């Protein structure tokens, strides 16, 4: 009788399929690892980076129509999107490479912050109505801690 789209295994894998040319590959790797670690700390879930098309969460940079019927829209506007837990395209996270990806300081959008938000979706979270929460549906650059009680409550409601 229990519902919520969620992963039914606790060790989730992820594959960085390609790379934006806006940042060094190591910096991109580290941004995604940091975004997963945000979630990992407060949940029984683990995240394992793999090199495999068969990862749970496939990560892809793309522009305009990129093969899922949810085209990106050029600069600004939509930044990224992610599908809820499930097989194949489900669980995957895509980033609009018509954006300038950075660490959010000076110019462009923080790849770390956007990815942390997308990974919330990829793990089954919807949007928050709390302006301060990571899952609030608007980008605000911050240097400080992104998680709010509401984000932690949401993920723990799903996974314990
Ligand atoms: Ca964990
Ligand atoms: Ca865009
Ligand atoms: Ca997937
Ligand atoms: Ca870009
Ligand atoms: Zn997409
Ligand atoms: Zn969102």
Long-range contacts of 84-88 (CB under 8 A, 24+ apart): 84/5, 84/121, 84/122, 84/124, 85/5, 85/6, 85/7, 85/56, 85/122, 85/123, 85/124, 86/5
- Ligand 6 centre distance from Cα of residue 17 (Å): 21
61 C-alpha to center of ligand 3: Å?
Answer: 15
Q: Kindly provide the resolution of this structure in angstroms, with one decimal.
A: 1.6
3-state SS, residue 61: strand
Q: Pick the ligand that lies closest to the CA of residue 23.
A: 4
Q: How far is CA 50 from CA 16, 23, 56, 142, 145, in A?
A: 8, 20, 10, 29, 27
By what technique were these coordinates determined?
X-ray
Task: Give the Å distance between the CA of 76 and the centre of ligand 4.
Answer: 11
> Structural domain boundaries of the chain?
1-160
Is residue 129 a contact partner of residue 123, using CB atoms and an 8 Å limit?
no
The 10 Å Cβ neighbour count of residue 75 is 9
Euclidean distance between CA atoms 97 and 154, whole angstroms: 29
Reduced to 3 states, what is the DSSP secondary structure of residue 111?
A: helix
Return the CATH fold of 1-160. Collagenase (Catalytic Domain) (3.40.390)
């Amino acid at each position: 009788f229990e519902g919520d789209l969620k992963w039914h295994h606790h060790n989730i894998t992820y594959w960085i399929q390609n790379y934006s040319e806006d940042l060094p590959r190591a910096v991109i790797d580290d941004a995604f690892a940091r975004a997963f670690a945000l979630w990992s700390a407060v949940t029984p879930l683990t995240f394992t980076r793999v090199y495999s098309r068969d990862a749970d969460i496939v990560i892809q940079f793309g522009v305009a129509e990129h093969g899922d019927g949810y085209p990106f829209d050029g600069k600004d506007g939509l930044l990224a999107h992610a599908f809820p837990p499930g097989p194949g395209i489900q669980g995957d996270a895509h980033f609009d490479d018509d954006e300038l990806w950075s660490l959010g300081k000076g110019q462009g959008y923080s790849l770390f912050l956007v990815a942390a938000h997308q990974f919330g979706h990829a793990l089954g979270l919807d949007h928050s109505s709390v302006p301060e929460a990571l899952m609030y549906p608007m980008y605000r650059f911050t240097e400080g801690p992104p998680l709010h009680k509401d984000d932690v409550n949401g993920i723990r409601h799903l996974y314990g």
